[PDB]
């Protein structure tokens, strides 16, 4: 009973001395692995590290080509072989600039304006209009206004012919052209100024359209000639601002007959419904659907005067 | 006979158990509560190692405006913070910068931006001298308003400056909706041949004049040696700080993670470490040293800005 | 953080 | 003297074996005191690469197509770091046993 | 059971040296009975002999030319005598003292 | 285990120190003690022995007065009590005899006689018939008054009560100052041939009559066992006795130590041996019988006289 | 240490256990050894036992011879040598009785009295000396009177002369002799008879003495004649007791002139000395010293008349 | 003492 247990006793701690010193073993292999762990790990972020050291891609900026020229054409007639973006620089041009160039049959058609879905506010002031603003891309689906001093620069360099796309909630697509379109300088505003309407299925709504409300129809509409005005300065022959009613720089005169900088209307045609007031300001395009159908698509595009089928009649 | 044996045993019976037992418990609990740390970790980065197979874009359009600096974009209707192009030297290509429009009155170029830990700063001086990291993200639509990480190259802020003086700004934010700003009337760097030395004027702010008054909360040479003006640019690569300039155990980049104007170190560390939550401690710290977004003037060097940006502007 |  | 000594065999014999089951008992000692410090170091580094790891991952959501995200807390880790070090009591013995 | 051999054993070792006192104890008490009843029967005859010696010894004053006389004493031997025969504790004999 | 031993080893060292050691130690005594009585005795005999190198002698005169019985010197003038010389038959010599001349009247001739065991009485039937031992010794000066153990011959004793009728006279005395009587006014034997048979008649004194009423203290047959008279003389070589006539081992006189008219043994007893003292016991008895100077009827069994006579005288 | 005592304390109880074999033996040859001298001792108590049977020698009673006769010379003449205690058996004697015989020159002398030492009373009554009393012995050295029957008897068988030796305390020897002595039988009392004085250095005592003191002493102590008278029969020819006044037996006349019965004064001789009485009693012999004078020894012997003495006488012319 |  007294040295019985203190024989016994050395048997116990003799033997969880090995349990004691299993499970000591069992630590320095859990620990080992670890280090290793740790390291396989220390490896893994040396390597994620550089992997997530390049930035994204821009893309956008990666499909702007890198001809040139005087304009679109110009453009084609260096290489440019898919619609895009590329820098241009007219002839007075300090700076080329970025601008959207749609090539069709082998002609580089240098878009002006373009509405698409009504993202991009066009109730801009003058200095806003003149140096352009919305936005450009690979594709032209984007609304903007490249600029009108830019496109000062780009018509006064040679003979251009102005062709306008429109696009109804049908979808459909008529157009219309007018030549050797160009702007007076800032000097005498941004005058709008064409030869003729050249052709379209459009409707010449720029030489004016009747509307049967007035005697001057045709007069209170007609854009050749007006200069250019925005809601912050008016230009136009109207005791008011039609720039401002319409809220959205143009060459304004009695108002309008082809109106395509007006507010974006969603769905069909806007309309005066429960008359609040009349304004018409819609994008509209009279000798083709009432002063109150605001378009859907919309593309100002310039081309130089002596192309195409010149010589087919 | 009966004590030693017997007695002895009441205190072997305190190591064996009441003790050395007791320690075999976190011994054991915690090398295979690490074995799971690690087993998560091994599996993030082995998960967005997958995720990067495919590298990031920005399909995001671009604004018909633009100029010479972010202040001429302005005055030209570009009134909206986002990415625009810009052309400050005519025989060198325009190029992407995130502009700010709307701080203290707009026109700000913004030269170096921090906002989320998207972008390394932790980059070679090659890297730092020809820029790095995103302008910008597309904000849904394809529009690129929503700032990104990066450092619009050294270089270029050199030319920036070098055609005419600017006038920088940093704006910064904590992580507890506070923020402070610190711009100073006049910045330009030299030229690479001299390290882009940096040289600044007028503070103003209320940040802390950390660039030229180094972080007020050190006395004496202390103090002194925390000043940025007149210091030159060091990175990973190349040290030209302030410290020991013989020994290269001596290097201000190494230790700090960032390319910046380190001078015997620093007192403001944008390009630094981006903690997240703001504060960390020296335990974390790569080098035990104070890396990341620090701007001791204003929260000391253990807290990492949330918001922190470099912004220049003529006049 | 400056140096010693 | 017959199992006089014998027995007096079996207690010098075990008088020894019991300064023997010391030694290992004490051995255990110095070793626990190691793989204490080793975890108090491998706690640490398993941290550090724990933040780096942090820092780093977020560099991917500006560098990659989809983007992940980390976690990061516990104290049961800053806990159980010094519980495991202050059971340095693998340091007691005893003075007696030398001649 | 590398030191409990020994001990253990050297423990059934005593017993088979104490077990033994007992088988020896054993015949000490087969002799001290057998050397009860001879003491008895040697304390009868030495004293009947005695007192017949006493009773001739007596004859010889009318026999012989000096007479001395033989004188008897104490009894304290059948006192004695009593303890060593009556004190028969003798008998005793355990039983696992066998196998 | 350990106490299944302390058990064992308990009950042990208690018998080896007591059990054993107690029995061995107080016999070793008793055989000690035994031995020291032998030599005791060795050197009593020894004594003995070597002072019988010379026989004793009586060297004292002789009374010049005479006659046939004692009575018969007592009315010659013969009044003190002492060796006498009588001649009872003028065809036979006189010879020596001890006359008590003051007990009872005196005239008593003593036939038997015990004062002190100087005389041998364990005789054959020879020497019984004949007579044996001392009469008298000698005073100091030359007359022998000091009465001596004898027993006048049987055959003697027979012719004196042929020639006429006596009457005995038993005087006994303890050890303690107490003296008894018992005479009988008849007394008479008949001749060898009879075994010399006993003849007594009329019982008177203190003592008891032993003779022809046996011991009272025994109650029927038992009793009637022990009556003497009418008996034949029995002797060590000479069974006579009423004890089994064919059986030779139912001998009163081998056990029993004297010759005597035993009767199916006795309940007077003179003639036994002379045991000191008074008291004895069967232990003591050569033959665990009431052997000894007895007289039943006056001190029971196992008390031997200190004093014991015969007396006889005509009328 | 108890596991280390219980076997220490074994160590200790197994030496002792063999000891206690040991002892047990020494027991055992200690209970050998006394067995044996019980049977030792059983031998020496037969042997006693048979030595101590023997009773003492009665060395007088064997010195007396076997030899016999009408009288102690008869004795002689059957081969009596020495002078001792012999039985002799006078003719009406009934029973042989013993004697002392005195045996000189061939002389049978048959002693009837003798005084030695005053050790036996004489102051005895008539029956007791008829009948005798004293002690006999192998040496005549003892006191006695023989008997006056038997006196009787031997006297009148024969003729016998009486010597009387008488002897004084300076230790002298004379004696005086008388004729045909003899005793009448008790019918005529014990008379004292005699022819005559034969001889003796002694003086005829018997004859009478004169003292002066009267005018008849010689006649008033003249014993021839005289009865015999003891202390309870006066029987002589004194108003008194002569017998009872000596307090002695014997021929008592006008008292005595020779008187061998008296009582035995040690020493010389008694006296009157502080006369407390006359009474003249000791052992005297007047013809050969005062009345007054006790003697030391005396013997009264007997021998036949028919004997003694010489002659020579030659024829002559 | 008689007898059996
Ligand atoms: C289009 O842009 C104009 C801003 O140029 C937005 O109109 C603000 O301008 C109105 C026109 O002058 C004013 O009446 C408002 O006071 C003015 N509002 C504020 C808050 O400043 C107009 O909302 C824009 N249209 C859309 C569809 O966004
Ligand atoms: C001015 C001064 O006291 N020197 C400081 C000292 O206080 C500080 O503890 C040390 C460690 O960072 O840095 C500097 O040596
Ligand atoms: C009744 C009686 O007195 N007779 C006795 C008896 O008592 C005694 O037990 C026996 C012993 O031997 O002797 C006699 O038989
Ligand atoms: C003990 C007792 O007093 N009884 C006695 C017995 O001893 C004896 O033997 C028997 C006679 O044979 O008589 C009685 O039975
Ligand atoms: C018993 C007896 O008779 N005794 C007497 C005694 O009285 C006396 O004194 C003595 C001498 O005279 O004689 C005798
Ligand atoms: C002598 O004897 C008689 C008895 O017969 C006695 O009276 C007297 O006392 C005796 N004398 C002595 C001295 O004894
Ligand atoms: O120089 C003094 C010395 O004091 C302590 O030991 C520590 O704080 C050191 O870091 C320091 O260098
Ligand atoms: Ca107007
Ligand atoms: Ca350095
Ligand atoms: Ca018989
Ligand atoms: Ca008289």
Same mark, same amino acid.
């Given at each position: 009973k007294t040295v019985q247990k203190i024989l016994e006793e050395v048997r116990i701690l003799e033997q969880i001395g090995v349990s004691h010193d299993a499970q000591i073993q069992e630590l320095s292999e859990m620990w080992r692995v670890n280090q290793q762990f740790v390291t396989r790990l220390q490896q893994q972020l040396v390597d994620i590290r550089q992997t997530c050291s390049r930035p994204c891609q821009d893309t956008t900026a990666n499909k702007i080509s890198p001809i040139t020229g005087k304009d679109c054409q110009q453009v084609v007639d260096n290489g440019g072989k898919d619609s895009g973006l590329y820098y241009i620089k007219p002839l007075k041009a300090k700076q080329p600039f970025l601008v959207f160039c749609e090539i069709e049959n082998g002609n580089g058609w240098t878009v002006i304006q373009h509405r698409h879905d009504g993202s991009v506010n066009f109730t801009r002031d003058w200095v806003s209009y003149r140096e352009g603003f919305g936005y450009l891309a690979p594709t032209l689906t984007t609304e903007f206004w490249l600029g009108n001093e830019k496109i000062h620069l780009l018509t006064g360099q040679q003979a251009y012919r102005l062709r306008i796309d429109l696009t109804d909630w049908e979808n459909t697509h008529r157009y219309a052209d007018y030549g050797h379109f160009k702007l007076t300088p800032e000097s005498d505003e941004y005058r709008l100024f064409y030869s003729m309407y050249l052709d379209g299925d459009a409707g010449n709504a720029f030489d004016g359209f009747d509307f049967g409300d007035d005697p001057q129809d045709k007069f209170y509409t007609t854009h050749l000639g007006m200069l250019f005005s925005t809601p912050e300065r008016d230009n136009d022959k109207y005791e008011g601002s039609c720039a401002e009613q319409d809220g959205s720089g143009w060459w304004m005169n009695? $108002?309008? *007959?082809?109106?395509?900088?007006?507010?974006?209307?969603? /769905?069909?045609?806007?309309?005066?419904? @429960?008359?609040?007031?009349?304004?018409? @300001?819609?994008?509209? =395009?009279? +000798? =083709?659907?009432?002063? =109150?159908?605001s378009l859907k698509m919309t593309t100002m595009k310039l081309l130089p005067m002596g192309r195409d089928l010149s010589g087919h009649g | 006979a009966q004590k030693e044996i017997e007695n002895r045993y009441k205190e072997v019976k305190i190591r064996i158990e009441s003790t050395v037992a007791g320690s075999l418990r976190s011994m054991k609990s915690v090398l295979e509560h690490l074995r799971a740390k690690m087993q998560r970790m091994e599996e993030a980065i082995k998960t967005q190692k997958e995720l990067c197979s495919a590298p990031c874009t920005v399909?995001?359009?671009?604004?018909?405006? %633009? /100029?010479?600096? $972010?202040?001429?974009?302005?005055?030209? /209707?570009?009134? !909206? %913070?986002? *990415?625009?192009?810009?052309?400050?030297?005519?025989?060198?290509?325009?190029?992407?910068?995130? $502009?700010?429009?709307?701080? #203290?009155?707009? /026109?700000? +170029?913004?030269?170096?931006?921090?906002?989320?830990? %998207?972008?390394?700063?932790?980059?070679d001086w090659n890297t730092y001298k020809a820029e790095f990291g995103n302008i910008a993200f597309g904000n849904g639509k394809s529009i690129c308003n929503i700032p990104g990480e990066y450092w619009l190259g050294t270089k270029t802020v050199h030319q920036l400056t070098k055609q005419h003086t600017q006038q920088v700004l940093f704006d910064m934010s904590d992580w507890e909706g506070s923020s402070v700003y610190a711009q100073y009337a006049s910045f330009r760097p030299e030229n690479e041949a001299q390290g882009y030395r940096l040289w600044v004027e007028d503070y103003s702010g209320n940040a802390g004049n950390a660039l030229l008054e180094?972080? !007020?909360?050190?006395? &004496?040479?202390?103090? !002194?040696? !925390?000043? #940025?003006?007149?210091?030159?640019? %060091?990175?990973?690569?190349?040290?030209?700080?302030?410290?020991?300039? &013989?020994?290269?155990?001596? #290097?201000?980049?190494?230790?700090?993670?960032? &390319?910046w104007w380190y001078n015997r170190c620093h007192a403001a560390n944008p390009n630094g470490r981006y903690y997240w939550g703001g504060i960390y401690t020296k335990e974390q710290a790569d080098y035990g040293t104070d890396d990341g977004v620090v701007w001791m003037n204003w929260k000391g060097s253990w807290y990492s800005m949330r918001q922190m940006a470099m912004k220049l502007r003529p006049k | 953080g400056h140096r010693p | 003297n017959e199992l006089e000594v014998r027995y007096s065999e079996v207690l010098r014999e075990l008088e020894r074996r019991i300064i023997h089951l010391q030694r290992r008992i004490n051995m255990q000692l110095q070793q626990l005191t190691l793989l204490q410090h080793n975890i108090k170091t491998q706690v640490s580094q398993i941290l550090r690469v724990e933040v780096d790891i942090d820092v780093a991952l977020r560099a991917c959501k500006g560098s990659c197509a989809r983007y992940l995200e980390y976690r990061l807390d516990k104290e049961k880790n800053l806990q159980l770091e010094k519980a495991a070090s202050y059971i340095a009591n693998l340091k007691f013995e005893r003075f007696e046993e030398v001649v």
């Open positions: 009695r $108002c309008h *007959a082809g109106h395509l900088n007006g507010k974006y209307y969603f /769905g069909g045609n806007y309309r005066k419904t @429960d008359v609040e007031f009349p304004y018409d @300001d819609g994008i509209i =395009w009279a +000798t =083709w659907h009432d002063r =109150w159908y | 399909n995001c359009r671009v604004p018909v405006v %633009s /100029g010479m600096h $972010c202040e001429d974009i302005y005055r030209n /209707g570009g009134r !909206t %913070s986002e *990415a625009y192009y810009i052309q400050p030297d005519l025989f060198s290509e325009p190029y992407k910068v995130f $502009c700010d429009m709307e701080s #203290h009155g707009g /026109g700000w +170029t913004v030269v170096q931006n921090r906002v989320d830990g %998207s972008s390394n700063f932790a980059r180094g972080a !007020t909360q050190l006395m &004496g040479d202390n103090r !002194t040696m !925390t000043i #940025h003006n007149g210091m030159q640019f %060091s990175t990973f690569d190349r040290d030209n700080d302030n410290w020991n300039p &013989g020994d290269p155990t001596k #290097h201000c980049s190494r230790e700090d993670a960032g &390319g | - | -």
